[PDB]
């Protein structure tokens, strides 16, 4: 409520913490920095995009836009922290988050990521309802892409030079999490095939979605026929997820 | 010019990797998310208005590398492209603000740099990056059975009053960054570029004699339709145009 109240107040101005975790340095792999080493290890990759914030400039000055957007981003960061996510990178209009690590089970990683995605979407969709429309600006909404990559498919390593560097992954499923982020509905979440087995492949929460590409549709997000690899993406019903939960 | 031979080792490295299918001593000290002119804003509630050139560099089709290559080879290829891009930006006094998996965010300008110099640096860096990927990596990926990789660059200039530097995030989970229409519009225009193309905003043109030799006005594409401006605020009579930047002819005439 505090973030939503702050945002409402700012919109009236028309013209569990992890404070020591640095960016670009997942704690399970930060030791790879300043070395030439690398490790294969599973991870859940989540890309969060905040859409329509640029429209804020039509009615608000840069300082108010900064307050609104950084408030939304703080809400997102704290949501991720609550569910043991590591914030890897800050975009202007979103976040890159890893779930999992050396002391986390793959099931726990997936559950954490799904809960964090549901809560981020809830905050932006519901707790900020009508606030932007009431002020004559476009509604701000989120898009979240989520994927799971197993150890053999997820390479942790150094990238860059000097301090212009990060410890990050090279993995098809990190890339596909980003791609599926672009595929989501307003305040929606899209997940890859590898997420489903960790939630009993429930068509209760997951609905197969065709991959949209320049006004046309394709059956898969990614295809390697030589390996019989046909990767599907699925809309994640996070609202039904939240309602049908004990907590 | 320089670009014709600058990247020979990077191109050779990438060819070698593709055969494996299944400016200053303190630039090295520059952290991400911490432009040297504004890094002091970290851990503060302070902010400063100051111009900047915002550049977004996107590398497209690199995910296709996974169809034929293992993660370590994909990493070697992408890190080579990234290293060439970082060194290019440093040569033209760019500050690398953020590393993506498939691109970079770069600022040009700062407290001891003229706006003109910032724009010139950014245009030359964009031209050199585009030259490297389009020409020195020509055909290399197709020879090995993967899709051709190309770049897209969006460039914009924001003046002092329209560019707010401030802290974002909390604790160490933070960066010093800009809130500015023109940073956002540089990001937007990046998606508007042609393959190996550069798209710039209106504020870039006066710094290059608005030469239609180099700049071609282009409409903004959005869900199969076209609009005249990247951004419009009618109440301020603000109609912001985007332009293709002919970097090849730019390089030719230097």
Numbering used by the authors:
A (entry chain A): 7 to 21, 69 to 300
B (entry chain B): 0 to 21, 67 to 298
Publication excerpt:
3’,5’-cyclic uridine monophosphate (cUMP) and 3’,5’-cyclic cytidine monophosphate (cCMP) have been established as bacterial second messengers in the phage defense system, named pyrimidine cyclase system for anti-phage resistance (Pycsar). Until 2021, scientists reported that a group of bacterial nucleotide cyclases, which utilize UTP, and CTP to synthesize cUMP and cCMP, defend against bacteriophage infection, proving that cUMP, and cCMP are authentic second messengers controlling anti-phage defense in prokaryotes. This anti-phage system, termed pyrimidine cyclase system for antiphage resistance (Pycsar), contains a pyrimidine cyclase PycC and a receptor protein with either transmembrane domain (PycTM) or Toll/interleukin-1 receptor domain (PycTIR). Upon phage infections, produced cyclic mono-pyrimidines activates their receptors PycTM, which disrupts membrane integrity by forming transmembrane-spanning pore, or PycTIR, which deplete NAD+, leading to growth arrests and cell deaths, thus protecting the uninfected bacterial populations, a strategy called “abortive infection”. In this study, we aimed to structurally, and functionally characterize both cUMP- and cCMP-synthesizing PycC and cUMP receptor PycTIR.
Among the discovered pyrimidine cyclases, only clade E PycC cyclase can synthesize cCMP products. The native crystals of EaPycC that belongs to space group of I23 were subsequently obtained, which contains two EaPycC molecules in the asymmetric unit. The structure of EaPycC was solved by molecular replacement and refined to 2.2-Å resolution. Each EaPycC molecule has a central seven-stranded β-sheet wrapped around three main α-helices. EaPycC assembles into a head-to-tail homodimer with two symmetric active sites at the dimer interface. However, unlike BcPycC, the N-terminal α helix (α1) of EaPycC packs against α4 and α5 helices in the same protomer instead of extending into the opposing protomer. Another distinct feature found in EaPycC is a C-terminal Y-shaped structure that comprises two anti-parallel β-sheets (β10–β13) near the active sites. The active site of EaPycC contains two conserved catalytic residues D102 and D146 responsible for divalent metal coordination, which superimposed well with those in PaPycC and BcPycC. In contrast to the UTP-recognition residues, Y50, D94, and R97, identified in BcPycC, EaPycC contains strikingly different specificity-determining residues, F100, R142, and Q144, for CTP binding. Indeed, mutating F100, R142, and Q144 to alanine residues abolished the cytidylate cyclase activity of EaPycC, yielding no cCMP products (LC-MS dataset).
